[PDB]
Amino acid sequence: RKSQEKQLREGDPRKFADLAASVGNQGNYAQRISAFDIDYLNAVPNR
């Protein structure tokens, strides 16, 4: 309790934390394509 009561110093990471929550945007989900079925030797295109 005595670590939270001093004061967050200027230029902290917490001040911009609230802004991050406001923007939201959870990142994208996994593609699900499996590296065993990619067939990478045939899948690469020339040019």
Binding site: V44, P45, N46, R47
Partner: protein, 160 residues
């Protein structure tokens, strides 16, 4: 050299004072310097994106990056990116000077000697400079893209 310095030199070697045609040339340069500076700023913005888009347009997924090609080894890929960054940067300098003499003095001097010594393919370089020119003419607009494409085509024509 400049366009200003070229006009001053052409007036100097005759012993001529600055007549009205030279003043017309300098005033045309002072008119075009606005878009020259704005074009140089936005080309200095995203030069790496221009080089990336140019190799993705022209050189990637060919046989050149396959084994046997000249861009197979990763030091050769880095040298390719370096050469394209050189072409774009010196074309920016020649665009802001308004005179292609720095291309003749600093880039196009002994370059075919080097590219025939190392076995560098010349036609793929010309097509890469062409893709550079298309990308920066799209990025900067048509009106400054003309002057950018003039010096990039100067590099392409002197290379061939």
């Amino acid at each position: 050299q400049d366009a200003i310095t070229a006009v001053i030199n052409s007036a100097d070697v005759q012993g001529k004072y600055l007549d009205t045609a030279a003043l017309e040339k300098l005033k045309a340069y002072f008119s075009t310097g606005e878009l020259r500076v704005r074009a140089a700023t936005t080309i200095s913005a995203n030069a790496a994106a221009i080089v990336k888009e140019a190799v993705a347009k022209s050189l990637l997924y060919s046989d050149i990056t396959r084994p046997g090609g000249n861009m197979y080894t990763t030091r050769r890929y880095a040298a390719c990116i370096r050469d394209l960054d050189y072409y774009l940067r010196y074309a920016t300098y020649a665009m802001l000077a308004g005179d292609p003499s720095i291309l003749d003095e600093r880039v196009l001097n002994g370059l075919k000697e080097t590219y025939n010594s190392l076995g560098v393919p010349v036609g793929a370089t010309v097509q890469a400079i062409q893709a550079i020119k298309e990308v920066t003419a799209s990025l900067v607009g048509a009106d400054a893209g003309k002057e950018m494409g003039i010096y990039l085509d100067y590099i392409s024509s002197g290379l061939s």
